[PDB]
Amino acid sequence: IVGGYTCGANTVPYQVSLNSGYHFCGGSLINSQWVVSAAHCYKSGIQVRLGEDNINVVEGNEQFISASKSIVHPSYNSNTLNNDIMLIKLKSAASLNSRVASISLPTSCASAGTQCLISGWGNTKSSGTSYPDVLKCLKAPILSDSSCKSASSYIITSNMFCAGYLEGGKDSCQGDSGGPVVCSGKLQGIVSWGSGCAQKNKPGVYTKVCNYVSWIKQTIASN
Numbered sequence: 001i002v003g004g005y006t007c008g009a010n011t012v013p014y015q016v017s018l019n020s021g022y023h024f025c026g027g028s029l030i031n032s033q034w035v036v037s038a039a040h041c042y043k044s045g046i047q048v049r050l051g052e053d054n055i056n057v058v059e060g061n062e063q064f065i066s067a068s069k070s071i072v073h074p075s076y077n078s079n080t081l082n083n084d085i086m087l088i089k090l091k092s093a094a095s096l097n098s099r100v101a102s103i104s105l106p107t108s109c110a111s112a113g114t115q116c117l118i119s120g121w122g123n124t125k126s127s128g129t130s131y132p133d134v135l136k137c138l139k140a141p142i143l144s145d146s147s148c149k150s151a152s153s154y155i156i157t158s159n160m161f162c163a164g165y166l167e168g169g170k171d172s173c174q175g176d177s178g179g180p181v182v183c184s185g186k187l188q189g190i191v192s193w194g195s196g197c198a199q200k201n202k203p204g205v206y207t208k209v210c211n212y213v214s215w216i217k218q219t220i221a222s223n
């Protein structure tokens with residue numbers, strides 16, 4: 001997260017860290033045994049870390065649970081990142097409490113102008129690299145598709161939405177991938193891609209979760 005602020009320990013209870021010997025992507029807990037992340041974060045040997053704040057220090061509220069199954073969206077395209085979404089089932093159910101909780105799925109799609117919360121342990125610099133050990137937060141609005149296209153020259157699909165600031169300075173970044181974009185207390189997006197980080201006229205692009213609710217529910221029900 002570039003240009004954000006320190007969230008505060010466990011204030012984003014649904015945030016998860018995907019670990020394969022080190023943190024490599026974020027994710028969101030949607031129920032006691034399932035996590036949603038980005039398809040481009042797919043990898044074998046994933047351990048899900050819940051209740052985290054400082055990812056390099058055991059602070060007392062963590063829950064480390066190995067993944068038993070990963071399901072990448074059937075239509076994921078790694079070239080365009082269309083359908084950049086993946087489901088991860090935990091080997092055992094997490095113990096839900098005030099520091100470890102699930103985030104609800106949306107019943108409707110959020111409109112442009114809506115303010116959302118983006119969080120992650122990703123790079124905090126637009127130029128160079130600096131990775132924080134504690135969770136960072138960013139308040140960002142959903143941009144209209146028309147304004148995003150005209151300013152960035154990105155090619156986005158109906159399964160994506162831009163969020164952030166065209167003026168640059170604030171944005172998600174490397175390492176925040178797979179993380180949550182929460183608006184009105186519901187999971188509306190997943191950190192997917194962007195050109196660099198916090199660059200002018202190059203906002204972040206997010207997976208539009210509201211288009212996948214049916215797939216998510218059906219998959220969880222039979223797996």
Ligand SMILES: COC(=O)[C@H](Cc1cccc(C(=N)N)c1)NC(=O)CNS(=O)(=O)c1ccc(C)cc1
Pocket residue numbers: 171172173174175176177191192193194195196197198202203204205
């Ligand atoms: C990969 O390194 C980076 O610093 C960022 C990461 C990132 C990830 C998710 C969201 C954001 C964001 N801005 N909100 C940033 N992405 C890039 O800089 C990628 N742009 S790119 O034009 O460098 C590019 C595009 C395609 C390939 C195969 C490789 C590189």
Ligand SMILES: [Ca+2]
Pocket residue numbers: 052053054055056057058059062
């Ligand atoms: Ca920790």
